[PDB]
Symmetry: D2
Subunit: 237 residues, 4 copies
């Protein structure tokens, strides 16, 4: 049903569905089998940052993930999103846990979308920046187990009172207003997203990951999308 | 019902309800009887620009209206919006015509809302910029007679095919996502809005005006709000 | 000689020159005797944030200083900077120590200056953001004892190798490009500055303070401006 | 001497030095012989817009030129600017005329430069926007025949009183503050430039072109760089 384009931060290697033998970042185009991946030296307990960029001139969706005092991981993929996604979309964050677990804490999230026309000084733009999430965040659509306000953070997956991450959990957060990614007169369309996250787990093999995604406006969590499916895909096809 | 705060560009003087004997700009706080006004040298057929600013430190809502090659009109009013508006609001543009008419064309509209916390580097923000409106503008809620797409413009009030403005019309456009104007930890909240408009009428006494407003999220056009009520207030009390 | 407008974070009370009997924030207009002050609950060793705003409509220069988990201090002063400062200025940060000392560490510094004309869509702007200072920061003019690069920070005053603040020190940092604060066709001019700082001292009565200032482009540190004069004024008149 | 990277809007085809047989846009890397070009349907007398983008992840310098109501021209080139340009540079606009002439009027110019570190929330940025140039633009370095203020525009090349473009002219405008395009801890560096221009000539074969360029900070107009050399290169090698 849903049309998904996502940049996944996959913490658990499911070699059976294509994942390499280590934590990695990937670019999914309508499938959990990333069309491109890169080795990601994930750090349990540290706060990392993910930057995602794209422009209609280059037609290259790229993402860079980093941790303070460490080398970053980068992954690019040539794709024309006008040929994949509809005109109006909704952007969001998703995460899941399965038998193995982890906290999927989002500490901040910014996003910028620009459509420049052939007309003189004619730019349309949308930009949001969340550095503090409140208990009643009305400009966010929360699905599944996602909640706001706990320490001013976004918890994508269920976390108990003592701070322990629960398993078999799945949650997503989408910005309220639909975003316009294509125009008829647009000479250049672009977008950039940034978000800091904290993945913490008492386990040695944490699972499953966090993903920034772009889907159709009426997108909802597919049934049985916990675990390796990251709350984005209905199956591993 | 609705809580309204608005900056009106009133083209028709209704001396009976408090309006001075000339076109003017005013600041309305829950009443059509502006709590403050300034003489506005309106120009039929020219494109003007309105800038609206406010910050929680100064607690002063100010607006400046200008036309190219002309002196501007300015009006300020000391008001603490935390004591007037709820935490979550929706911003928008409204216009109306009555026996006398005019076109209420919006050529562009930008808005910025910032909430800075006492935390280090903790800003929440929302910013939108419409320089080109399309026929299916999904991130706008259109009410009454407002329509998009005609020449890439927003027509707040009904306009016929030949370009002639209709009377007894009323329309509003609100940004889709609710805006957060107050926090508990906020040390400074601010917002600024800018919009260009074209008021054209074949009449010598055009009516009624355009208004940028901020209301509760479920705000709708009150019954019989055409004419002097600007599509904002149910009565002239 | 120099024309100075400054927002001072005064840590040492010099009751003899007008300072109240406690640490405070003040607004100086060509004199060290603040034309307006507010009690500031300074915290030794904590990182604080100062926000400074001004717009030509309100003609009110305001500043808010805060620390995480604490109430903020605010101070405003009605002043028309067009009547005080020249058309072109340079913005900067200054600090000093005297018999009593403190570190005057600047961890970040952003600044935005806007001039909006009566012309349609005619904004001139300058915006810089320093979150990391390098050893050779070419877009900054360093005067006195100010240095960059140490831990990616700006040290306005001299600090020894072991991290200890030296006395009788004075340093300033100015952005390289002159800023334009007034136009002939401007309908609204505004600026906002933000900077995080760390004041640390082994003493119980730290001195002297940090100040964000705006002066004429060829401004230099006046002789004997260490101590209470904050590196801004030649005398206490 | 000078290290130049430029995006040229070449109006006159000098087939002898590599230029195709028509007006075109090109990307020059230390040579007037563009390493990549695209057909440009130049329009005498119309105002066009040029957008230039680049990011250190993609390592692709792209430019899109357009006119209202027309299809745009685009050209990309894979190049790592860290391997071509020094750490600190100056950005600018240049133009020239020779036997054949044209006006090289710049109506607006914006530029954004960002350096994001691996540190949490650590962005350095510079952004300037000129929509109105004044007679004494202190934040611009003008070289050759470039002048400001005439109708609030930047005239890169000499124009007489009656509005007629002169030949054998050459002028450049550089932003005052040096820009930082590379860091040691940077995970992503990017920049985008936009400028509107008006090329008008009474001739059927106008010459020579306008170029947005990035060079070393002490860059000056090379001798005999009028005509086909665009005020950027000393020779056509
Ligand atoms: Ca996996
Ligand atoms: Ca994977
Ligand atoms: Ca009226
Ligand atoms: Ca009125
Ligand atoms: Ca003092
Ligand atoms: Ca003082
Ligand atoms: Ca040529
Ligand atoms: Ca060429």
């Amino acid at each position: 049903a849903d049309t998904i384009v996502a940049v996944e931060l996959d913490t658990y290697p499911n070699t059976d569905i294509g994942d390499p033998s280590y934590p990695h970042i990937g670019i999914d185009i309508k499938s959990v089998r990333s069309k491109k991946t890169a080795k990601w030296n994930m750090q349990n307990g540290k706060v990392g940052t993910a930057h995602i960029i794209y422009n209609s001139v280059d037609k290259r969706l790229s993402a860079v993930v980093s941790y303070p005092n460490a080398d970053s991981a980068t992954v690019s993929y040539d794709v024309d999103l006008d040929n994949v996604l509809p005109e109006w979309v909704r952007v969001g964050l998703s995460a899941s846990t399965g038998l193995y677990k982890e906290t999927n804490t989002i500490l901040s999230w910014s996003f910028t979308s620009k459509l420049k026309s052939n007309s003189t000084h004619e730019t349309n733009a949308l930009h949001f920046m969340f550095n503090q999430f409140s208990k009643d965040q009305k400009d966010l659509i929360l699905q599944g187990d996602a909640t706001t306000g706990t320490d001013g953070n976004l918890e994508l997956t269920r976390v108990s009172s003592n701070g322990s991450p629960q398993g078999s959990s799945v949650g997503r957060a989408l910005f309220y207003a639909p975003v316009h990614i294509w125009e008829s007169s647009a000479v250049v369309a672009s977008f950039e997203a940034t978000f800091t996250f904290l993945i913490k787990s008492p386990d040695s093999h944490p699972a499953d990951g966090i993903a920034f995604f772009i889907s159709n406006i009426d997108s909802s969590i597919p049934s049985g999308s916990t675990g390796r499916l990251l709350g984005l895909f209905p199956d591993a096809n």
